[PDB]
Design an enzyme around this catalytic site. Structure first.
Site, PDB file in Angstrom:
ATOM      1  N   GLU A   6       3.467   3.838 -11.514  1.00  0.00           N
ATOM      2  CA  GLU A   6       3.217   3.360 -12.868  1.00  0.00           C
ATOM      3  C   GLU A   6       2.386   4.326 -13.692  1.00  0.00           C
ATOM      4  O   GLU A   6       2.654   4.534 -14.873  1.00  0.00           O
ATOM      5  CB  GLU A   6       2.695   1.906 -12.907  1.00  0.00           C
ATOM      6  N   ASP A  78       1.423  -0.136  -6.778  1.00  0.00           N
ATOM      7  CA  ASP A  78       0.328  -0.689  -5.983  1.00  0.00           C
ATOM      8  C   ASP A  78       0.742  -1.861  -5.074  1.00  0.00           C
ATOM      9  O   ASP A  78       1.728  -2.520  -5.353  1.00  0.00           O
ATOM     10  CB  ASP A  78      -0.791  -1.160  -6.922  1.00  0.00           C
ATOM     11  N   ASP A  80      -0.181  -4.934  -4.472  1.00  0.00           N
ATOM     12  CA  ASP A  80      -0.373  -6.360  -4.783  1.00  0.00           C
ATOM     13  C   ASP A  80       0.905  -7.040  -5.245  1.00  0.00           C
ATOM     14  O   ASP A  80       1.968  -6.395  -5.316  1.00  0.00           O
ATOM     15  CB  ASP A  80      -1.518  -6.557  -5.808  1.00  0.00           C
ATOM     16  N   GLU A  82       1.765  -8.082  -8.199  1.00  0.00           N
ATOM     17  CA  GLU A  82       2.224  -7.478  -9.429  1.00  0.00           C
ATOM     18  C   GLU A  82       2.992  -6.198  -9.118  1.00  0.00           C
ATOM     19  O   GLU A  82       4.046  -5.947  -9.705  1.00  0.00           O
ATOM     20  CB  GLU A  82       1.047  -7.175 -10.372  1.00  0.00           C
ATOM     21  N   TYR A 282      -7.677   0.813  -2.242  1.00  0.00           N
ATOM     22  CA  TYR A 282      -7.234  -0.067  -3.316  1.00  0.00           C
ATOM     23  C   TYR A 282      -8.234  -1.195  -3.608  1.00  0.00           C
ATOM     24  O   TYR A 282      -8.801  -1.817  -2.687  1.00  0.00           O
ATOM     25  CB  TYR A 282      -5.869  -0.648  -2.886  1.00  0.00           C
ATOM     26  N   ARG A 284      -7.852  -4.186  -5.338  1.00  0.00           N
ATOM     27  CA  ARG A 284      -7.511  -5.620  -5.446  1.00  0.00           C
ATOM     28  C   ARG A 284      -7.218  -6.037  -4.026  1.00  0.00           C
ATOM     29  O   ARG A 284      -6.156  -5.711  -3.446  1.00  0.00           O
ATOM     30  CB  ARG A 284      -6.263  -5.813  -6.300  1.00  0.00           C
ATOM     31  N   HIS A 314      -3.715  -5.614   4.282  1.00  0.00           N
ATOM     32  CA  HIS A 314      -4.744  -5.439   3.255  1.00  0.00           C
ATOM     33  C   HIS A 314      -6.015  -4.947   3.923  1.00  0.00           C
ATOM     34  O   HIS A 314      -6.271  -5.230   5.093  1.00  0.00           O
ATOM     35  CB  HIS A 314      -4.961  -6.745   2.542  1.00  0.00           C
TER      36      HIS A 314
END
Length: 581
Positions: A6, A78, A80, A82, A282, A284, A314
């Protein structure tokens, strides 16, 4: 092969690692989204979302389609929910969904990136569906209520469910403070040899004048009890998003949005005079887990710097390279980045170190006449452990007395005090509460608080958060008409449901149908609402004032005196139907 991300920052960091074997492309944000002012979900097709290429992004889309025809197009968004949806939109537009074309990593470092590009996976559709269900839930609430709320209070409920639950927390806190009745009491301490002890009482008490004279007259005590035990203290856990935001607020004064902005810079890789360097994993995450490789590097650093006696998908938020010390990081980091990296680095190294060890002495002193007792504790450090890195102050001292021994001289301090209500939230302690109650998630803590402040639903004054007139009036409306639906409890239940959709333990459709049943059964689109509250304000003529809302917004009025205007963001709480300004 082609890799798409992104952001230009991530693209440059990735290209630095991979060299000319891969072409790295940044989309410069989202390419596809639900309509900006069409509702966009088909309630007659079991919540079918309607997506379109975002205006201005058509050329990026064409480039992606072209790349996908020329070679494998790997997607490095990323990790997550999203990010998983971003990956899905690119795969769908390029007709590559189902291929092993999604790259997963918690850090943008050579070892990790080089392995990750060799091990792409299929897009995880359960994760995508959890994201899409979140979007649809927000869109249903948003497009149903924001017009009703515009018609009546000239304000909106975007970020809606979580935002209204969080606003409720702040209002509930304010009512707790409003209703608090302080109680006067005496704090009574005895002081001898650098030690202190507090009077032993069943409850906080306001002593009478003659009892106080007597207590103040004490100059000698006798040790009634002395108990010594070992006390170990656990190192902090590695950061996750919630605890990073809390500590960066209390230790650095960073707003939770600033923390996340800086953390994103440190994760994506910062441009230096010579290249690009990622500093942290990361940002989040709800996990405090540490990879085996990172655990081993930490053991190696601790061993070398401190000694072996200090050694404890994670992932925690932690330094990518524990040997890049905060001091060394200073040549690459600006002042705010340096502070945040230092915090993260110290928390991580400390989390890998041994618990500290103390001997605790708990003691009781009494008067010779036996009328009064005083209790105290003191610590003696045996081993500092993790406290070598994570700075800690503790009540250390010595208790050079035995049971039955008299101590003299003693000095008594008597101070009149008043009980205090709970403190207001700060951004950091509001995050703590959102985590506690299950209403925030790593991607929504900071955005919720920012939006509440930006809409003027809450106001920050010397770092504490207050509800406003508009926040209170909007919340009161939602409570009256959407009681179950906007509750903290129902918001938490939905967030858990979306976690279950991600994990494949519930279907998006079942979750969405449940919500929509509950929502639609109470949603009244044609609601018109005359604001009319009694208040705690009085005008000149002695009458109580009432709060109203007109073409120039909120105002106070009394059936006698003149009208006084009020800003949407003046501090206010509603309790038992009355607004307290």
């Amino acid at each position: 092969k082609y890799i798409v991300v992104e952001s230009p920052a991530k693209a440059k960091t990735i290209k630095s690692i991979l060299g000319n074997e891969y072409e790295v492309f940044a989309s410069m944000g989202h390419i596809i989204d639900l309509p900006k002012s069409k509702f966009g979900v088909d309630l007659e097709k079991d919540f079918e979302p309607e997506f379109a290429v975002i205006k201005g992004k058509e050329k990026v889309v064409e480039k992606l389609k072209d790349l996908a025809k020329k070679g494998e197009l790997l997607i490095a968004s990323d990790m997550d929910r999203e990010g998983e949806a971003i990956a899905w939109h690119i795969a769908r537009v390029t007709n590559t969904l189902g291929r092993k074309n999604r790259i997963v990593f918690s850090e943008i470092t050579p070892r990790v990136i080089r392995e990750a590009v060799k091990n792409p996976r299929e897009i995880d559709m359960k994760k995508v569906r959890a994201q899409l269900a979140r979007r649809i839930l927000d869109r249903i609430v948003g497009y149903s209520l924001s017009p009703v709320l515009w018609r009546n209070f000239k304000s909106n409920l975007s970020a809606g469910r979580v935002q209204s639950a969080t606003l409720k927390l702040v209002c509930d806190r304010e009512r707790e403070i409003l209703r608090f009745v302080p109680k006067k009491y005496h704090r009574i301490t005895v002081n001898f040899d650098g030690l202190t002890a507090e009077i032993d009482v069943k409850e906080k008490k306001f002593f009478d004048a003659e009892t106080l004279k007597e207590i103040q007259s004490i100059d000698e005590l006798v040790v009634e009890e002395k108990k010594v035990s070992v006390k170990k203290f656990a190192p902090p856990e590695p950061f996750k998003t919630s605890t990073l935001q809390q500590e960066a607020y209390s230790k650095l004064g960073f707003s939770v949005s600033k923390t996340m902005m800086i953390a994103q810079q440190l994760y994506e890789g910062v441009e230096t005079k010579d290249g690009h360097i990622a500093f942290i994993t990361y940002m989040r995450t709800d996990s405090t887990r540490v990879s085996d490789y990172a655990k081993e590097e930490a053991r190696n650093l601790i061993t070398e710097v401190f000694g072996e006696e200090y050694v404890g998908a994670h992932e925690a938020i932690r330094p990518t390279n524990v040997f890049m010390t905060p001091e060394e990081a200073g040549k690459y980091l600006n002042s705010d980045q340096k502070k945040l990296y230092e915090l993260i680095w110290k928390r991580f190294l400390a989390s890998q170190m041994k618990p500290s060890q103390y001997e605790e002495t708990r003691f009781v002193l009494r008067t010779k006449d036996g009328k009064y007792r005083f209790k105290g504790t003191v610590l003696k450090k045996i081993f500092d452990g993790y406290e070598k890195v994570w700075k800690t102050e503790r009540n250390t001292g010595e208790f050079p007395f035995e049971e039955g021994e008299s101590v003299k001289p003693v000095v008594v301090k008597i101070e009149e005090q008043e009980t205090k209500p709970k403190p207001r939230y700060t951004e950091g302690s509001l995050v703590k509460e959102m985590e506690r109650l299950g209403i925030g998630r790593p991607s929504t803590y900071a955005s919720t608080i920012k939006l509440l402040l930006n809409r003027g639903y809450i106001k920050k004054i010397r770092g504490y958060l207050y509800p406003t007139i508009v926040g209170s009036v909007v919340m009161d409306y939602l409570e009256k008409k959407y009681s179950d639906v906007v509750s903290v409890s129902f918001t938490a239940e939905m967030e858990k449901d979306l976690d279950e959709v991600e994990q494949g333990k519930k279907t998006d459709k079942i979750v969405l149908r449940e919500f929509y049943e509950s929502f639609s059964s109470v949603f009244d689109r044609n609601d018109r609402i005359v604001v009319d509250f009694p208040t705690n304000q009085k005008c000149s003529c002695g009458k109580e004032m009432r709060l109203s809302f007109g073409k120039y917004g909120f105002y106070l009025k009394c059936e006698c005196g003149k009208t006084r205007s009020v800003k949407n963001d003046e501090i206010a709480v509603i309790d038992d139907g009355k607004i307290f300004l």
